[PDB]
């Protein structure tokens, strides 16, 4: 066997001031980033974990050692008490959020489709969190392995980096929804679906009235039509 630690522990009992500095000194993590494979459940990522998706591969790295995380750190350095209350208050007013509503407008512009979207407020919370930390596109489809609907969060760039604080907020706001990272036709997508709450009584008729007054960008609605066409034969696993 091995007893190589025995001379140190005899010394550590005699020198307490050295024991404090030795324990505190063990701060540098040996593994700063580890490879992952898609489909990847984001629920496997802890509070300081960041997700990186690229042609270089898929990685679950430590935020404290990550340069992409460090750059965004002064901008989103924001309390949960006001964060939880923020997307709850912003659920009442959906006018500025053109990207979210345009997806509903392009797919099915009826009040019955808007009734079903507003029935799952956690999906707007997912979009709100991912918007802050930017140019994402949402797609609503029916869950064939659950009368509930699932959301696809399509990323615009060939390179993707989800901040450790951003996915901490994302998982927290969507407790009751499973978030899995996928790749479909060179596009990185996050599938937000029900796995198994203080939310306002959403008036579907009032937002539907506002939708008629709102003038959407034509190029964004056709983009959604093309994106919905591309994600039809996706078939995400359970």
């Amino acid at each position: 066997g091995t007893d190589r630690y025995a001379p140190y522990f005899a010394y550590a009992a005699a020198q307490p001031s050295d024991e404090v500095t030795t324990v505190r000194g063990l701060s540098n993590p040996l593994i700063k980033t580890a490879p992952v494979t898609l489909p990847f459940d984001l629920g496997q990522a802890v509070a300081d974990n960041c997700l990186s998706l690229s042609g270089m591969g898929y990685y679950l790295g430590l935020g404290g050692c990550c340069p992409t995380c460090a750059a965004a750190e002064p901008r989103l350095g924001s309390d949960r008490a006001a964060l939880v209350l923020a997307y709850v208050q912003q659920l009442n007013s959906i006018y500025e959020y053109r990207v979210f509503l345009a997806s509903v407008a392009a797919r099915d512009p009826s009040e019955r489709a808007l009734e079903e979207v507003l029935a799952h407020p956690e999906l707007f919370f997912a979009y709100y969190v991912l918007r802050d930390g930017r140019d994402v596109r949402v797609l609503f489809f029916e869950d064939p392995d659950a009368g509930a609907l699932m959301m696809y969060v399509v990323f615009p760039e060939k390179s993707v980096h989800v901040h450790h604080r951003v996915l901490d907020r994302l998982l927290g706001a969507c407790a009751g929804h499973r978030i899995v990272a996928h790749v479909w036709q060179t596009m990185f997508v996050l599938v937000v679906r029900k796995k198994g709450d203080d939310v306002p009584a959403v008036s579907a008729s009032d937002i539907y009235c506002k939708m008629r007054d709102i003038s959407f960008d034509g190029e964004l609605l056709l983009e959604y039509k093309r994106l919905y066409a591309a994600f039809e034969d996706f078939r995400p696993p359970r």
């Binding site: 091995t2 190589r4 630690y5 025995a6 001379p7 140190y8 522990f9 005899a10 010394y11 550590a12 009992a13 005699a14 307490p16 050295d18 024991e19 404090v20 030795t22 324990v23 505190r24 000194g25 063990l26 701060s27 540098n28 993590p29 040996l30 593994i31 580890a34 629920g43 496997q44 990522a45 802890v46 509070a47 300081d48 974990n49 901490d168 998982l171 927290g172």
Partner: protein, 168 residues
């Protein structure tokens, strides 16, 4: 006596410790209880306390620490022997994340830790690569990560080992 040392080891962090052990006859029962309240992000020096328990005993043992989600805080139960049925994290050195739901628990014994250390090609030289538990209390869940930590300056650690070798 061991609680005095454990409180000193954890003095740097914000982990509460609860207040006799015979070196010739070690107890099968729980030796220590380390608590971590909601919101906290403190680190537990797992490998260090497990190896400290091995040096404390003069009779062959396999020290074990159980990590539980009490549904309010994180619980770290200390043992000189892994109790029958006690859980062990199936983690590797690279893949070390464990998410604990309310009332659920995981654990780590020195022997199982040594197997992980050797399988991951990690350095066995004293205090060069030490496993520590990084815990994030995100209610109702307890997020754990069994990461290997090294010193910021290895030249300082090698000199400390010489000081221990000198006094022998």
């Amino acid at each position: 006596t061991l609680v005095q040392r454990l409180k000193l080891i954890l003095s740097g962090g914000n982990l509460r410790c609860s207040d006799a052990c015979d070196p010739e006859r070690p107890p099968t029962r729980c030796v220590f209880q380390v608590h971590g309240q909601d919101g906290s992000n403190d680190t537990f020096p797992l490998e260090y306390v497990l190896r400290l328990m091995r040096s404390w005993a003069h009779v062959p043992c396999d020290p074990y620490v159980r990590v539980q989600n009490t549904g309010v805080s994180v619980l770290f139960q200390g043992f000189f022997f892994r109790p029958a049925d006690a859980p062990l994290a199936a983690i590797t050195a690279e893949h070390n994340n464990v998410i604990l739901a309310s009332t659920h628990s995981t654990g780590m014994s020195l022997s199982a830790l040594d197997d992980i250390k050797r399988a991951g090609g990690v350095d066995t030289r004293p205090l060069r690569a030490m496993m520590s538990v990084s815990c994030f209390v995100r209610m109702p869940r307890v997020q754990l990560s069994f990461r290997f930590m090294g010193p910021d300056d290895a030249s300082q650690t090698q000199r400390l080992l010489d000081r221990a070798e000198m006094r022998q």
